[PDB]
Amino acid sequence: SARRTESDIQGFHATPEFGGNLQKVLVDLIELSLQGKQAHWNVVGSNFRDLHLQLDELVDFAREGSDTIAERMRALDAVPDGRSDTVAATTTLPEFPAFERSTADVVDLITTRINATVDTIRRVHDAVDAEDPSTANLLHGLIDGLEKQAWLIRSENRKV
Amino acid sequence: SARRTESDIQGFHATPEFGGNLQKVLVDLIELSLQGKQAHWNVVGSNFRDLHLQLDELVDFAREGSDTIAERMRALDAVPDGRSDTVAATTTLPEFPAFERSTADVVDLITTRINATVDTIRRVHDAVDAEDPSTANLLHGLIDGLEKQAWLIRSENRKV
Amino acid sequence: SARRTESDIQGFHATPEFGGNLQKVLVDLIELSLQGKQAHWNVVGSNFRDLHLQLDELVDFAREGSDTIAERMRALDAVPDGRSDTVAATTTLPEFPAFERSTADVVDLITTRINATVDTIRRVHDAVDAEDPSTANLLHGLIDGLEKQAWLIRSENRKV
Amino acid sequence: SARRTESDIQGFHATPEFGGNLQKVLVDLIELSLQGKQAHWNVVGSNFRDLHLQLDELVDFAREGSDTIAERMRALDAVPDGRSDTVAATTTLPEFPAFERSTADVVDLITTRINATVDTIRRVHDAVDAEDPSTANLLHGLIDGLEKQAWLIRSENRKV
Amino acid sequence: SARRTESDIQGFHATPEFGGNLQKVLVDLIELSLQGKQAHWNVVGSNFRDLHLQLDELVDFAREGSDTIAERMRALDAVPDGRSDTVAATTTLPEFPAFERSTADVVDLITTRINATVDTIRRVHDAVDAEDPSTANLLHGLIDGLEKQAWLIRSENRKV
Amino acid sequence: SARRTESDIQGFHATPEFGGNLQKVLVDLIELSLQGKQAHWNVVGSNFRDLHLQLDELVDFAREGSDTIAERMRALDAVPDGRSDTVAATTTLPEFPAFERSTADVVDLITTRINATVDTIRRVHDAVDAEDPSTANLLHGLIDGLEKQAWLIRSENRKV
Amino acid sequence: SARRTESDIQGFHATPEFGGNLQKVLVDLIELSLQGKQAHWNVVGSNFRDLHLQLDELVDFAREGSDTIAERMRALDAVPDGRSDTVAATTTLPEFPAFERSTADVVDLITTRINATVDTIRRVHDAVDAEDPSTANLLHGLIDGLEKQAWLIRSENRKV
Amino acid sequence: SARRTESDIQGFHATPEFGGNLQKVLVDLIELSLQGKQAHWNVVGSNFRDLHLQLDELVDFAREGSDTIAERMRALDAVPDGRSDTVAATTTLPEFPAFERSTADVVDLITTRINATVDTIRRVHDAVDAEDPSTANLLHGLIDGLEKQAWLIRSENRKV
Amino acid sequence: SARRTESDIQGFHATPEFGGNLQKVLVDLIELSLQGKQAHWNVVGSNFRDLHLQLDELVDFAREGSDTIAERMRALDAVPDGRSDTVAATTTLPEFPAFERSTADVVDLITTRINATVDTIRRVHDAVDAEDPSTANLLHGLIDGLEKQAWLIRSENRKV
Amino acid sequence: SARRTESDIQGFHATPEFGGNLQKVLVDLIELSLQGKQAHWNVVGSNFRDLHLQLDELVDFAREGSDTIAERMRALDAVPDGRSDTVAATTTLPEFPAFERSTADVVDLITTRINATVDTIRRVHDAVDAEDPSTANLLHGLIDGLEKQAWLIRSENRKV
Amino acid sequence: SARRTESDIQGFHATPEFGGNLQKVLVDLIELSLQGKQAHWNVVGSNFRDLHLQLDELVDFAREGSDTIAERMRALDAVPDGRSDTVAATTTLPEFPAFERSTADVVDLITTRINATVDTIRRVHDAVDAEDPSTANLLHGLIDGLEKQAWLIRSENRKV
Amino acid sequence: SARRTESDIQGFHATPEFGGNLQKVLVDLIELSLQGKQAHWNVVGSNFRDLHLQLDELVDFAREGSDTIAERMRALDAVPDGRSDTVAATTTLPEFPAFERSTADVVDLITTRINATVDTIRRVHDAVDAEDPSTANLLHGLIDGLEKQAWLIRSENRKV
């Protein structure tokens, strides 16, 4: 009665631009995960353990975030690229330095890299929201979670 | 002292239109749940097990979704109708066919029905968001979750 | 030695009548689940919370029951029909009323609907047991569980 | 290489008005949690246990909510004040009465105070959303959750 | 529409003899659980710990069994009596002795008392099954479980 | 250097008075458990479910309590007697009435029986504490736990 | 006082025929377990993973089933023989073929072997039920569980 | 034989002095909880994370403690007052300062406030123990738990 | 750059001799599992329960071991044979005797069968290690676990 | 209004006598833990498994006990010494013998050593209670727990 | 006294070659992780779901493996480099192709890449084992785990 | 039939030197666990909590390690000696100091003592491996785990 008589109903298709916007978020989340693990392993000095542990929590969040974004792309028939070459060639994050780094340095370095990642999400937000508010919801989750990590990490170096 | 002195403070009340819009979402979520179980029981053929299992995950999400929407109606002083006669008389989803269906047919059929359910949510979205953004947030969760199910189901039939 | 030399041994096949008998149970279990959720959402008044919660437990049991019955049908190569139109057209349960209902009314209404569902299982029991005692075992579980729910719900309205 | 150069990328900082708006939400959430426990301990009469238990769920939600808001403030460089004197001096919630209170009275009292808490969040919503949609997402969760609690609690006193 | 009309469909009610038969099972289950704890506390000697632990498992099973039977009585409009005076006055189990008892003695004593409990259930089985096969299903679980306990306990005293 | 050279070091053992006092606690705990289940099964009327559930929680605590006391006796070379005849013959608890009882009646009946049980523990407390403060600690747990149960149950019948 | 005064009460003893009948069930359950693992390890081809996993679930059920039957024999003073030589010499199941087998062949092969195992249980059912209905209940569980496995496995090969 | 024949047996009730003493403990526990969260949110500097985490554990314990004391009051017919105005007006704890505070400062501040809370419990201990040793047991748990928290926190600022 | 330009890279292939060596381990693990269950069911006498339980733990380990070995064979493209006929025809373990066996006898019997199984693993160890050290690692796990079981079981019969 | 204005509020600290008394408990708990493991590893003979398992449970409790006492010392500004040399030099426990020991011997040996440990706690109890009843509470837990362990172990060698 | 008297005892230090060898393993494990996710997101076609899920299990193992290797480097005073640029510049794995790939192609592609990763571990094995057998043990775990993944993935494409 | 004949197949027995080498590892593991707890309780100063927690993880690992070694000795017919006097008299670990120690000092002290424990295992490794590779596998786990702990602890004191 109210039933649609259509045998093939199409779902929501993302524009290629929308897919490209999520791709920008994806590579920065993957890069953040890789840099987070680098910091996690190579951090040394005063309050090593807290930072070591907090960095793993950041990596967990960024990895879950990259899944969320890539899966959202797929749901809307965009196609993600999380390969190493693409991530290195297109990430906006400043390169993480090599070798052992002090806890103080790692705090400042990782805070900057989190903030860079959040900036990318904030930059594409309005364009994403305009096409698909449901995806903007996912972006809000990432912004909230990453900005929480930034606070939890940077607070170590704060002097009051 | 910033304390209010009213003995009676009323809650947010949904308009009849708003109530009607959530009712539209509700009946399609219940119908999708019922069709999902039908497909889950009656699918046979190549890759039976994967689809059988994925369909149960779809049903779980749709059932949780119907609860969310119905409870949201109740919170806003609206009254849901999820009775079988009402669902059958008012759902926009094409009827699920009777008897055993092949994996390939079930994939196509259910994808269309998920697409139809999501279309209803997308159709009422802006009107809901205009009156109550907090409810639109719930709708974003439903859209994201269902379109993910559509991807996980439909990909069986996608060739190269 | 004692091994059967048969390359293709057939399993137990249910008669169509047996399948039809389980189908009667299936539609009443599905209808009970739908009515239970309707009551769960729309119940109001004294002792709201207990009934709200108990009704969800009833729905959980009826949903698990419908899976059990439909899966048993499939195991014996019967084909279930749990679609909304079929449920509405063939259920023996009295229609659940629309709108908010008092806890006292809901208690009486749902007790009657549980008892109707149990009656269907009791009605087909002997015919089912005669063909397949193993399925009668499943029916015993449903009778026991539903009659427990009837007691737990109806006790609210009992005056001694 | 699309890598950014800067070593000190600063995070999103909230305006004083934004921090002030989240502070308003925070004090009302803390007050609600304190009032919720007061009601939880001191409620007596018909259907005591259900209300006793539901009030604990409300408190749990309000406490998680206060953490969410205070932490969001910290993430955005704002400073929460959840101290007893501040909460008492600035909460908009009508004072909860001391001593034992009937279930019927507690239902009415707590519903009013939940509605007051929600009103604060609804009042600041648009200003919060205008500056930071990600924070508005957190507000939506709070509105949804608290309005659910209001329904679950107030339904006890409903007439027909 | 195959919907029934009646608003007050009554449930299956047990005959006085049926309730009496379940009452017989109930008192022997409660007595066994009390005797099981008595043995659990007071057993001493070679292989104490194994018997101590196994007796607790027996008690657990007997207690769950008593709940099952008493609740089944309630479901079928019968009224259990599990009070201490009634249990003592009507149990068919041989009295368990007071004071410390050897493991070997406890094995023999408890095996006899389990067997007595099973005998009661076996004695009422056919009359229960004739009136209500669903209840006989519950009896089968009790027979199976208790006879397993008897084997696990008595095997301690076996010769070759 | 400080090692004792004794081959057999004996444990602290209870005096006959002490053993007798714990036995008094034991029988009232078992009797409360038995009456608790009787009430649990046979309670009917307004707010049935809450009382039904709370009575099971009371029984769980009383059962754990009886184990605690009986095991403490065994630890101190005393012998418990939790057999039905002994419990019925020596309990100080007023007899629980037969048949179905209203929720209001069960509240008053059970509150009285909990209070009787606590009175027994309070009556023996000082004598127990004088001989063995470690056992008095166990009594404090029981008093606290049972008096909480009394509050949670009795509050149903309070009118303010 | 309704207490029995026998110092020795014997348990239910199975006849040799009954013991033999359960032994027939046991050897086919063990053989099915062994063949299930063989198939699980050696299946290759289209939809490998689903079958690999489902076969492990079948093995788990058959192993649990063999335990149930063997323990039931022990409870009734019968003596199981699950040794490899006996299983190989007395199983009624057709031999599982050697080496790697295709998914399609494994589906057909295992379905036949489940069918064979269930046939043994159905063949001995009435004789078992006549002597001991409680054991027949266990058989009903085995029939239901195994025929469910047969459906979940065989449906891979069922076309339209 | 030993059964009391009283229809109404009353529970142990707190004297006004006793109720007053527990109220004193209650407000300091709630105040500690509130200051604990304030410190948790606003702590910054060296070893932020450890302190952030430890303060949450302190708050969890203080919250459980406040429930314990308030529930104990209710059990003994006393009425708690945990409202914000009352806590602020009657707490003995030194006020927690506003704004961000260094880890070193928070360690000293919180240690002092924990000690103040414990002092209150130690001050009321003997009077509580004299009237009701069972409640003194609860006080012992609180003293032990809070003094552990003080050690775990203060140790950060120790120099040896 | 360092990337291999090969479109099809082959994995490690086990020699047929290596596969045959793992096959020897596999049949003895399967035989040990079958004999362990035989002992588990049929053991009687002093300390029945401990042995009954320990034998199940041995069986669990041997079953997990057989999976490990068979899966390792498959990973390296060997093909396991765990069929009943093959196990009986090729196992090196002495046959387990029929009928009920005393705990003392079972201890000695099972210790010998564990030791036989370990001997097979030790016999093939060097040949396995020489081709694939990673598989020798798995053998070390089995040797350690089985030799632990041998100690735990045999200790029952040790006289010092 | 009632707020203390002190900047530094000090915690309760143990006197040298108190610290010394807890140290005495600490070394006997650690020694018991060490002997418990020695017995656990080296026990052989009849009922090996039960004793092996029970000794591990004893060790778990003694280890938790040692943590409790040492942490209590730290909370009260006392310094524990649980080093091997100190434990060996100052423990009151009779030395555990070397080599394999029979189950009968281990039962007697360990019971004696548990009793020695409890004696130490009972000897210091009153002095501890006089200074700090909160710590006496911890001692009550240890006495109760260890005396339970003594009962569970010693009962093996009892003959009645 | 066998105690050493050095105030400083250094740990095992890896040679530069050893560090380099683990670095080779690390970059291929990270690359495999990244390629695994790419395949997981972008696979479409027959048996999509099984591969999608299995690829996630592969990624989990490879991520855990990279952690193990990097942490082992840190333990032995070596410094890992898991940054994207380094992984892309130094991995031996063939590049994963862009865009959607069929199930069959993904099976072949990923199998080759697992084979490549395992080859690196096998290539460095002997050099690692020669310097530090404990690290070789970790390598054995990686080889076993990855070759198992290769089997579970590749078997989809293996025909008869 | 490839079945062996012997009824008494003996297990692998360790040489006196082998048992002696495992005894060396055992005493150093027990000593480390005792020193670890000493440090855990008595550490104070900057980053107390992290070290406090990490030291407990070390103790957990060392205790599991000691069980592993002692049980392996038992499996191979060797007899462990983990008694306090033996540990003190034969441990190679430098004595841990008494009293409170700074975090910086504890980091250096514990790192040295972990390294000493690892050195013992590294010293006996080749002789253990030569006689029994399966035991060397256990040593590898210990080396890996302890060297990880050393890194996690020592990194606190690292400079740049």
Ligand SMILES: [Cl-]
């Ligand atoms: Cl509830």
Ligand SMILES: [Cl-]
């Ligand atoms: Cl799956």
Ligand SMILES: [Cl-]
């Ligand atoms: Cl931490």
Ligand SMILES: [Cl-]
């Ligand atoms: Cl056990």
Ligand SMILES: [Fe+2]
């Ligand atoms: Fe994903």
Ligand SMILES: [Fe+2]
């Ligand atoms: Fe719901």
Ligand SMILES: [Fe+2]
């Ligand atoms: Fe189902």
Ligand SMILES: [Fe+2]
């Ligand atoms: Fe928080």
Ligand SMILES: [Fe+2]
């Ligand atoms: Fe019950």
Ligand SMILES: [Fe+2]
């Ligand atoms: Fe007990």
Ligand SMILES: [Fe+2]
């Ligand atoms: Fe079994």
Ligand SMILES: [Fe+2]
């Ligand atoms: Fe509470």
Ligand SMILES: [Fe+2]
């Ligand atoms: Fe396997």
Ligand SMILES: [Fe+2]
């Ligand atoms: Fe500790």
Ligand SMILES: [Fe+2]
């Ligand atoms: Fe890691």
Ligand SMILES: [Fe+2]
């Ligand atoms: Fe151990």
